[PDB]
Design a protein around this ligand. Structure first.
Ligand SMILES: Nc1nc2c(ncn2[C@@H]2O[C@H](COP(=O)(O)OP(=O)(O)OP(=O)(O)O)[C@@H](O)[C@H]2O)c(=O)[nH]1
Ligand SMILES: Nc1nc2c(ncn2[C@@H]2O[C@H](COP(=O)(O)OP(=O)(O)O)[C@@H](O)[C@H]2O)c(=O)[nH]1
Ligand SMILES: Nc1nc2c(ncn2[C@@H]2O[C@H](COP(=O)(O)OP(=O)(O)O)[C@@H](O)[C@H]2O)c(=O)[nH]1
Ligand SMILES: [Mg+2]
Ligand SMILES: [Mg+2]
Lengths: 52, 433, 44, 60, 428, 427
């Protein structure tokens, strides 16, 4: 029970930072974007990226 | 529109905050109930409601209902939100395992519930500002869980603690070396900066600098009140050169594990003695590196300074401080480390300090707050590590800690953790050619 | 004409300096302070 | 010994004389509005180098 | 008609910048409301060099102001000037730059790049012609050195042909303010040498030195340390603004000033700064007395000419003078001691003049110097950085902000390249 | 001369319109009572386009105040300037239209429409030659959407050639007031595309978004929402109303605006919406209008054009304009960024310079340009509809008042036709 709790707590942490997860899928692969895209949210992205 | 959240935990922490919060109300002109006697300087430690009521941004938590009651029913009754001013259920009773496992556990959920309800009202938050101890159970074990939960719930917020270290020569608690070793696993990588205020500074500064004999804790806490007001005033009062909180962190701290500075409030002088001399910028800077004025019982001549941060208040001209720094750098006795040739800051605030009624401090044209990072605090643990292993060698006072659920092996894990931290100050004190 | 122009320019700086120093005795004697820079418990 | 904290009410001669506060009334307005963004389109006259508009008269 | 737009980044950049707009508004007859209240028509006929024309009478100065702490923006707006400034032009962040180059150039200052490059763009299409750029900043913190160098890069691709000027406040060991100042400045000037055309270096030590030794005042705070010292040099652009006899604008002065396209670091100076007591003790003409500025008691940088050679010298003059005695003093200052001058450049000095002096002085001069002794100001901060890089003193606040170990080595090597060239043309 | 009758519908249209009849009154110098105290006769020349002429020095608006809810009409009757409005022109029902299109179009809506038709027929018969009608509502609300589309369908049957200028608030994409905004909007879009000849796509989100940063007001209430929509439809009719260098009317705009007669959904915009703490520094001249007109923020449809090519552009300029400087900028905007401009039309920019200055302002215009990006709303409301249609969500209280499943599919299919028509005419 104690072991599956961390499995079912770290599965909640990453899946609740999903807004961050979508943005981090842009800070990888298409790199040289990270300085002016990292500290943002999902709505700041796709609107910042509109500007570019 | 920038603000600093404070949390005060422990009997030591709550009463040094009563001296902190009496000074905050008397700095900004706020009555002991909340309303202004009749700016944006309130919005660092104070939230403005529909009326003139300024609810304080602190949350006071302790497991003893006795010490929380006299501020619940004192002259600051109407100031504090009565659900912010949270009590406990039973005393932690000088036991790390009690404050970490069995009785401090039923208060984490309610404390973190109030930190969330306070941080969302926040809009430009800079970081936390912790207040605890090292001796008792709730000053050491209950704050350990706080650093455990705030590191994962917040993360990138820069937390600062004004710890009160166990004194090397006098002491008030028997098992407080046990409490001051196990807390070090959670003040190393779960604390961004950690100020140490030992009970040997105002032990004798209140005797030699101030002509008053026989000081008590309501005079101990005022000097701890003055320094925190001096640090945050750069966030709070305008200046010729301001030092933000994040400004202050990356500059004073060398290394991720070396964030344990000393402290010094230089113009601590009595009213009947202050008119006997002029208090210049050069004089008050020369009087702050003296080994009889630091906040921790450690001789700075043994160590070498890494980087020093100076915050000046009130009437200070930024040429005399540059003359003061150059004059105090050329003396051989105060020796710095080779890999940091500059090793200095200045910080200017226009507003001079206030003095509380009944205080023994005299108000000044200029006040300097010297915050030094030394490797002379390496031997701050030397008289505590020898204090530790002598008691630990024959399993003295161990049955209570293992009787409350704490494993035996976590004593030696904190033992080797501080031994490695002592090795770091031996590594950085060696010159490289 | 250039001699009198330099003659009139130097005494203009003499006239500027006494007006510069008479401006001193105004702020030095009266010494206004804005209520925004006073403590809330000092105002009455 | 904790009742002495808020015990003595202040004199008019305790607090500092220069209450120089921070006066963020303008930046609070500027943060509320979004900072200027060029989601706008070309409106540029053809800015040229030397000579603005040639007459080319009396010859050519 | 011929426009340059000002750039202001940093607390030091804003304070010097705000004081700069006080001096030119005093000179051009512009009040702290925008309207004209001066005397001569020779003041408004070139209001289109620094100022933009508002609805009626008012002249709004074009100057982007940026910082990460909004307290400095509150100070410039609630200041002895400020209503002339444009609130839409005021742009800032939420949290400070933390005195860290990496956080002020990569992770926190990069969110404002779109907004700060916008207000440059909207102040670039309103120009009949863009003569150049102009920035006031510093090399101490991330607001001025971090975002400032990020402003240097982002403008350079969009306007490559146009020149661009920076007013840098370089660190000094005698006036130490930040322990990270040797990290910040040695990595900033990597981006002040690749994509700039001419830059000026104004350290605080010589600012304190000339304000004590010459001006004869007791407490030099920063306000009066810029009005009669630092903002007077910024009026070198009077050739763009005032009629002169033969004049050198920011393009003309700089093109025959820098010898090689990556060696442009200059020493500023202002000639008449006598005292408030000894002004009626000497003559405001140009003898060998007030024109031989070889003694560095009237110099805005620490390193003196005695330890190097002058590559190229410029001097813009103000007032009703004739251009022989300024020309024969050039004969008299080069031939009296030619051992301190570059041999293969036979004419090392430039003279420009304007007919309208600043008010209060009937004759004024501003001096700019390219010296091979400026490496002494760069070699000293090299050892401030290598000793602090050998033990990695404050490195990990750079490592976690998206920048690796290698950019420190490139910045150290490029300055070590720069100090080697100033040494290579030392004697030749 | 030419005349316009306003057929304000629902909450939304009356709040817009009563404040529109505010602005027109202030534009004509008309007092809250209605007596003409204006100075320039140019106001009095074409005043009968809006102000039908009553007795006692006083004109009454042609506004047929139409609503079903008992108390929307009490607000505009008790409004500050509400005294001008004719009491017969205050027709109201005795039940609320439940924010449902069905009840506002078949049972509770379609009883007042008989009484509504009687008075609008009277007002048009009183005047001489109509340029075209005006109508304002929201597609989200019940009597805005249902009773709104009851008008235009039953208006055109004896006003065919009059241009139907229904200026509706298509429901805001982000800001969702009513839960069942998708149903009410979809049925209305279905009955505006063949029905109306000219419609302006207006979104409360864009109404918010303009007034956050351009007008600087930190609280865009319902008042300044009504400021903005009033200003874009005083502008499209001012050049008829007031003397002009290049005169353009409602017909003259649309014949120069809609290329194929099902593209009536236009995209409004007003240029000089400067911050009221920043109007001091603007140098308010032609190039900064044309820049601000052609700006993604300053348009009351929440969509950004950019993706959508401008099929056609109007600029109904107000004020004293340099005519060269207007003429140059209109090409210079068009030629320099030709990507969002259709290639099968070489020049799609329409200019309508009108002599009189705007109210208080020096000079203005009205961008009502047709982009194919208007489909972005119609795509959003469509998915918003089919999310709720696929389980027949609020359809249960629709069939009782007189719907069927078929009209729900027909409205969704027509709106798929509308987006596909926009995708097909963009090349
Ligand atoms: N600075 C200061 N120290 C105090 C005060 N009251 C007691 N102390 C001493 O400071 C030491 C540390 O205090 P704590 O660790 O917080 O003790 P505690 O929180 O009461 O212990 P528990 O409640 O059982 O967990 C104690 O040994 C006390 O003797 C005070 O008001 N201010
Ligand atoms: N000469 C001059 N120097 C200044 C002034 N203000 C600040 N400075 C110095 O210039 C340095 C620049 O620091 P800065 O980069 O602006 O710090 P930051 O705002 O946190 O980035 C500071 O260390 C100050 O010591 C000024 O007005 N004049
Ligand atoms: N734009 C605008 N909308 C308004 C105003 N007052 C109420 N509303 C709107 O009215 C809509 C609600 O529809 P409503 O007309 O009340 O429903 P109905 O009366 O049954 O047709 C909401 O979307 C609101 O935006 C106003 O002043 N301006
Ligand atoms: Mg206790
Ligand atoms: Mg015509």
């Amino acid at each position: 029970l104690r072991e599956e709790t961390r499995v079912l707590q770290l599965q909640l942490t990453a899946l609740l930072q999903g807004d961050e997860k979508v943005v981090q899928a842009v800070i990888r692969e298409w790199k040289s974007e990270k300085p002016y895209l990292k500290n943002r949210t999902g709505q700041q992205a796709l609107e910042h990226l509109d500007y570019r | 529109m920038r603000e600093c959240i404070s949390v005060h935990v422990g009997q030591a922490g709550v009463q040094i905050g009563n001296a902190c919060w009496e000074l905050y109300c008397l700095e900004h002109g706020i009555q002991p109930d909340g309303q202004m006697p009749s700016d944006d300087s309130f919005n660092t430690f104070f939230s403005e409601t529909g009326a003139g009521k300024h609810v304080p941004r602190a949350v006071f938590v302790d497991l003893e209902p006795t010490v929380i009651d006299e501020v619940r029913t004192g002259t600051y009754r109407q100031l504090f939100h009565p659900e912010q001013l949270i009590t406990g259920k039973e005393d932690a009773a000088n036991n790390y395992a009690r404050g970490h496992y069995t009785i401090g556990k039923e208060l984490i959920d309610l404390v973190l519930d109030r930190i969330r309800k306070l941080a969302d009202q926040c809009t430009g938050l800079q970081g936390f500002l912790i207040f605890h101890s090292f001796g008792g159970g709730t000053g050491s074990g209950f704050t350990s869980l706080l650093m455990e939960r705030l590191s994962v719930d917040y993360g990138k917020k820069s937390k600062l603690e004004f710890s009160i270290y166990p004194a090397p020569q006098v002491s008030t608690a028997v098992v407080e070396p046990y409490n001051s070793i196990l807390t070090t696993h959670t003040t190393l990588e779960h604390s961004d900066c950690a100020f140490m205020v030992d009970n040997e500074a105002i032990y004798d500064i209140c005797r030699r600098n101030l002509d008053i004999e026989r000081p008590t804790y309501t005079n101990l806490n005022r000097l701890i009140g003055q320094i925190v007001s001096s640090i945050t005033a750069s966030l709070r009062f305008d200046g010729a050169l301001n030092v933000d909180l994040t400004e202050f962190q990356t500059n004073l701290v060398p290394y991720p594990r070396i964030h344990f500075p000393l402290a010094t409030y230089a113009p601590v002088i009595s009213a009947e003695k202050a008119y006997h001399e002029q208090l210049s910028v050069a004089e008050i800077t020369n009087a702050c590196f003296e080994p009889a004025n630091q906040m921790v019982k450690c001789d700075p001549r043994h160590g070498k300074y890494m980087a020093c941060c100076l915050l000046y208040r009130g009437d200070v001209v930024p040429k005399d401080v540059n003359a003061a720094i150059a004059t105090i750098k050329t003396k051989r006795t105060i020796q710095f480390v080779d890999w940091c040739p500059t090793g200095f800051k200045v910080g200017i605030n226009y507003q001079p300090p206030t003095v509380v009624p009944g205080g023994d401090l005299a108000k000044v044209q200029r006040a300097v707050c010297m915050l030094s990072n030394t490797t002379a605090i390496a031997e701050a643990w030397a008289r505590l590590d020898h204090k530790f292993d002598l008691m630990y060698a024959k399993r003295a006072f161990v049955h209570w800690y293992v009787g409350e659920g704490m494993e035996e092996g976590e004593f030696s894990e904190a033992r080797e953790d501080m031994a490695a931290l002592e090795k770091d100050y031996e590594e950085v004190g060696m010159d490289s050619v | 004409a250039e001699e009198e122009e330099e003659r009139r320019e130097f005494e203009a700086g003499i006239a500027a300096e006494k007006s510069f120093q008479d401006k001193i005795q105004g702020i030095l004697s009266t010494h206004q302070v804005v209520p925004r820079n006073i403590h809330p418990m000092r105002r009455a | 010994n904790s009742s002495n904290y808020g015990e003595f009410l202040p004199m008019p001669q305790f607090f500092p004389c220069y209450y120089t506060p921070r006066e963020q009334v303008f930046s609070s307005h500027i943060r509320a509005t979004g900072f200027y963004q060029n989601n706008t389109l070309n409106t540029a006259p053809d800015r040229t180098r030397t000579l603005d508009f040639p007459n080319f008269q009396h010859t050519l | 008609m011929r426009e340059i737009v000002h750039l202001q980044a940093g607390q030091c950049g804003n304070q010097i910048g705000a004081k700069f707009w006080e001096v030119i508004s005093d000179e051009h007859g512009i009040d702290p409301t925008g309207t004209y209240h001066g005397d001569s028509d020779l003041q408004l006929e070139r209001i289109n060099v620094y100022y933009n024309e508002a609805t009626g009478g008012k002249y709004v100065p074009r100057a982007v102001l940026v910082d990460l702490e909004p307290g400095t923006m509150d100070s410039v707006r609630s200041g002895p000037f400020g209503q002339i400034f444009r609130p839409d032009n005021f742009v800032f962040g939420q949290s400070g730059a933390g005195n860290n180059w990496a956080k002020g150039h990569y992770t926190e200052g990069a969110e404002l790049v779109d907004s700060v490059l916008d207000v440059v763009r909207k102040e670039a299409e309103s120009c009949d012609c863009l003569q150049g750029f102009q920035l006031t900043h510093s090399l101490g913190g991330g607001t001025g050195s971090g975002m400032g160098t990020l402003l240097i890069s982002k403008i350079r691709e969009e306007y490559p042909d146009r020149i661009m000027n920076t007013f840098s406040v370089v660190p000094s060991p005698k006036v130490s303010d930040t322990v990270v100042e040797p990290y910040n400045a040695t990595l900033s000037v990597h981006q002040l040498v690749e994509n700039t055309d001419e830059t000026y270096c104004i350290d605080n030590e010589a600012l304190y030195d000339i304000c004590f030794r010459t001006l004869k005042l007791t407490t030099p705070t920063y306000g009066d340390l810029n009005h009669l010292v630092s903002a007077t040099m910024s009026g070198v652009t009077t050739c763009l603004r005032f009629p002169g006899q033969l004049n050198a604008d920011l393009r003309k002065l700089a093109v025959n000033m820098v010898p090689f396209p990556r060696l442009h670091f200059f020493m500023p100076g202002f000639a008449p700064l006598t005292s408030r007591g000894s002004q009626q003790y000497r003559a405001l003409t140009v003898p060998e007395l007030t024109q031989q500025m070889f003694d560095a008691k009237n110099m805005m940088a620490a390193c003196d000419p005695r330890h190097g050679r002058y590559l190229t010298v410029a001097a813009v003059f103000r007032g009703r003078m004739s251009m022989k005695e300024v020309d024969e003093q050039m004969l008299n200052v080069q031939n009296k001691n030619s051992s301190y001058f570059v041999e293969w450049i036979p004419n090392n000095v430039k003279t420009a003049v304007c007919d309208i002096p600043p008010r209060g002085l009937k004759m004024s001069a501003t001096f700019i110097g390219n010296s091979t002794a400026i490496q002494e100001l760069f070699k000293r901060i090299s050892e401030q950085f290598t000793a602090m890089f050998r033990r990695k003193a404050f490195l990990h606040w750079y490592t976690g902000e998206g920048m690796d170990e290698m950019e420190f080595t490139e910045a150290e090597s490029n300055m070590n390249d720069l100090v080697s060239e100033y040494q290579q043309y030392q004697d030749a």
